[model samples]
Target: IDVLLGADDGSLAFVPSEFSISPGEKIVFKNNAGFPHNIVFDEDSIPSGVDASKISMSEEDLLNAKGETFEVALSNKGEYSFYCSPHQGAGMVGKVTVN
Candidate 1:
């Protein structure tokens, strides 16, 4: 999916942000801009029985390299909210639906 770390005009975003998928599916956020971007799940926002750490990023990374990849393994069922740690304050956030 698309997430900016920007775009043609240089705006921070999580384009193609919201997602829905199956338990075995996963998310690969490829940095599209030239800035450092990190992916972390919202602990309070995920399902009550789910462990945020299980599906969140395994390696703490600042995906600053152009075209670099950050992958999130998915499982369980519920709504999931995530954000770019450094940019969430600016609304660089995302959501997911799983079943």
Candidate 2:
């Protein structure tokens, strides 16, 4: 399943920052924020995360604009960590669980 996360004008905010999915399932990253944002996967022992700068990985760039969508494949069973490119330092982050 997918959800639309709204941040307050580039602030470190994710409307609903938690989710779970199956191996073949996916989460569509929807950015409803007024400013720009990006979903960068924080390096963890779990499945691989997103890095918006890559051409083959578009999910990392979900916050490129409002209403943008990014599809993330849940391939591992563990906790996943992610953050916004511009606000990660400020704690704009989220977590996911795959079962």
Candidate 3:
């Protein structure tokens, strides 16, 4: 499945907002409308002891074009929350639950 970024309005968002995935399954995040998007996991919100950095992308590596995309696979079973680095305040957030 895909988690669309910048969905709805140009203000930004993660289309499904919430999603479920099996361990190791990859979910693609696409820049559906707004540009300059990327996923940055909330370090404090992920499962304890897991390196959140492994699932995060810095703004320096942002996907700035429409249709740009990236794939992520959370191998650990837990709740993961993230947001668009540049649009964090615009409510561009999402959640992924791994089982």
TM accuracy, model 3: 0.91
Q: Can you tell me which runs of candidate 1 are displaced by over 4 Å?
A: 1-5, 58-60
Which whole-number lDDT from 0 to 100 does residue 64 have in model 1? 77
Q: Give a tens-digit lDDT track for model 3, residues 12-89.
A: 778888989999999899988777888999999998887977888975678988888888888889999898888889
lDDT of each: 0.74, 0.64, 0.85
**In candidate 3, which residue ranges exceed 4 Å CA deviation?**
8-11
- Count of steric clashes across candidates, in order: 0, 0, 0
Q: Candidate 1 vs candidate 3: which has greater TM-score? A: 3
Clashing pairs in 3: none
Error of 1 at 25 (Å): 1.0
Model 2, 1-99: lDDT tens digits are: 865556556445776788777876868877776446667665543455533243123344445667877766766577777776666667677887878
lDDT (Cα) of model 3: 0.85
In order of appearance, the predictions have TM-scores of 0.83, 0.71, 0.91
Clashing pairs in 2: none
lDDT of 1 by residue, 37-83 (tens): 77788889998888877766633658777888766667778899988
Instruction: Quote model 2's TM-score.
Output: 0.71
